[PDB]
Amino acid sequence: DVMTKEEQIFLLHRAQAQCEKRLKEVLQRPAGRPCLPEWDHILCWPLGAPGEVVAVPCPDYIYDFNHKGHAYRRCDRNGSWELVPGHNRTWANYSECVKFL
């Protein structure tokens, strides 16, 4: 059916809950110095290999997203998600997921 706004909010809460459960498991058995999972209001980013671009498919639970594309983050070598150069937010590229970019 055609998805309503409040249905979208509901599925985001379900995804946020799943992210909190996923983050609690990794913190109970850590190893190495990777980028840790975190929720960004849209999707749960997974463990990131230090010094590499991390690609996640545009979440299938977002009706308005292109489910064949990927969203991208940057994980530096110290195991920290990279900031946008010149700003104080985490860098993320969602251009493939949306038509207005």
Binding site: D64, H87, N93
Partner: peptide, 21 residues
Amino acid sequence: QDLRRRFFXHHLXAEXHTAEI
């Protein structure tokens, strides 16, 4: 019509895509 969900897309975009435009 269903533009409410699509505009709520725009905001979560705004709050998401942080790379230089």
